[PDB]
Structure formats: C-alpha cells, structure tokens
Amino acid sequence: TEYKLVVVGACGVGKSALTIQLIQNHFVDEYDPTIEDSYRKQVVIDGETSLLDILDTAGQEEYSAMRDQYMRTGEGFLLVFAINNTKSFEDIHHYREQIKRVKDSEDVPMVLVGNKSDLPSRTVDTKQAQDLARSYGIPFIETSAKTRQGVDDAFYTLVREIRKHK
Ligand SMILES: Nc1nc2c(ncn2[C@@H]2O[C@H](COP(=O)(O)OP(=O)(O)O)[C@@H](O)[C@H]2O)c(=O)[nH]1
Numbered sequence: 001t002e003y004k005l006v007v008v009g010a011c012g013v014g015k016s017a018l019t020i021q022l023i024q025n026h027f028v029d030e031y032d033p034t035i036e037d038s039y040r041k042q043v044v045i046d047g048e049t050s051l052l053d054i055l056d057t058a059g060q061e062e063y064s065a066m067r068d069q070y071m072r073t074g075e076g077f078l079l080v081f082a083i084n085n086t087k088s089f090e091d092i093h094h095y096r097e098q099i100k101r102v103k104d105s106e107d108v109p110m111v112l113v114g115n116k117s118d119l120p121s122r123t124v125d126t127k128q129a130q131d132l133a134r135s136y137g138i139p140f141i142e143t144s145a146k147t148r149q150g151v152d153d154a155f156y157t158l159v160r161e162i163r164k165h166k
C-alpha cells in the first residue's frame with residue numbers, strides 16, 4: 001500500500017527539486033529545510049492505488065548517522081546525478097555501495113536518474129549513464145525538475161521495482 005522512497009545523490013543535483021516537482025507540480029529555485037520528515041502523495045500505478053512516502057532530507061542529510069537512518073527507512077532509492085556534473089555521476093557507485101552495506105543486502109530496489117536534462121554543457125552522455133545502469137541491471141531515466149520531463153517516470157519506475165519485492 002505505502003512505498004517509502006529516498007532520493008540520494010550529490011549536493012545540488014536536484015534531489016529536493018525533483019521531489020517538489022513530483023509532489024507540488026512546481027519547479028523551485030530554492031526551499032527551506034522543513035520540520036516535516038516526508039511528503040506523501042496518492043498515485044495510481046498500473047491500475048493500483050499507491051501511497052508514495054518521499055523523505056525530505058534537506059538540512060539533516062549532512063550527518064552520516066542521519067543518512068544511515070534514511071537508508072534503513074527507505075524501501076527504494078533514486079540514485080540521482082546531474083548530467084552537467086561529472087563528479088556527481090562518478091560518485092553514484094559509492095552511494096549505491098553504502099546503501100547495500102547499511103541495508104545488509106545486495107540488490108536493493110534502485111533507479112538511476114540523470115537530472116537537469118534541460119541545461120546546456122552536458123558532461124555525462126546518455127550512453128555513459130545507460131552503460132552504468134546496465135551494469136547494475138537497473139533502469140536509467142533522464143529527468144528535468146524544471147520541465148518535468150521524466151519526473152513521474154522516474155518515481156513510478158522505482159515503485160514498480162519495489163512492488164516486485166514488497
Ligand atoms: N535547470 C535546472 N535546474 C535544476 C534542476 N533540478 C534542480 N535544479 C536547480 O539546482 C539547484 C539545486 O537543486 P536542489 O534540489 O536544492 O539540489 P539537492 O541538494 O540535490 O536537493 C537549485 O537551484 C535548483 O533550482 C533541473 O532539472 N533543471
């Protein structure tokens with residue numbers, strides 16, 4: 001019934017912007033860290049009503065112990081990098097490994113997300129991202145929190161993965 005999703009990735013790749021676009025249908029330039037721990041949205045996916053619970057980690061995410069808590073909480077994870085930020089892409093494998101270690105489980109439902117597809121000066125090619133995703137055996141989705149391209153697709157794909165195991 002309820003799916004706990006956690007969006008992960010480097011500082012400034014668009015984690016909050018993607019979540020807010022999914023929940024509020026608006027693009028933000030900025031946001032305040034909030035007392036609320038998550039946003040919840042009812043959606044219908046493949047004919048079934050589902051509740052998406054997406055953690056709002058802004059602020060407290062800087063603490064590793066808190067990230068450990070978020071990872072234990074999450075059922076599925078969006079691995080987000082920014083297509084104009086090579087380092088954010090190169091760090092994806094570290095984040096993936098950390099999640100697997102914390103959850104004490106190989107193969108945790110994940111989707112690779114390349115965000116900011118609307119911006120110029122792409123430094124990560126689509127084929128690069130697809131190759132990485134293929135190596136993990138997970139879907140790759142290009143997104144823009146600004147234009148909303150791929151946003152619903154990214155989160156719904158993640159839900160479909162989680163649904164196969166819980
Ligand atoms: N043009 C564009 N800007 C974005 C996109 N996603 C996020 N941003 C901007 O990038 C900055 C960092 O986004 P933010 O959500 O705070 O990154 P976070 O640290 O990963 O949560 C903000 O100024 C956003 O407005 C996108 O898809 N396109």
Ligand SMILES: *CCS(=O)(=O)NC1CCN(C(=O)CNc2cc(I)c(Cl)cc2OC)CC1
Binds near residue numbers: 008011063
């Ligand atoms: C904008 C900088 S910050 O200090 O406020 N937040 C940083 C903290 C470190 N960081 C990551 O560890 C990125 N990966 C990641 C994010 C989250 I939220 C969770 Cl739950 C797990 C991971 O890695 C497993 C980037 C932003």
Ligand SMILES: [Mg+2]
Binds near residue numbers: 015016017057058
């Ligand atoms: Mg944020």
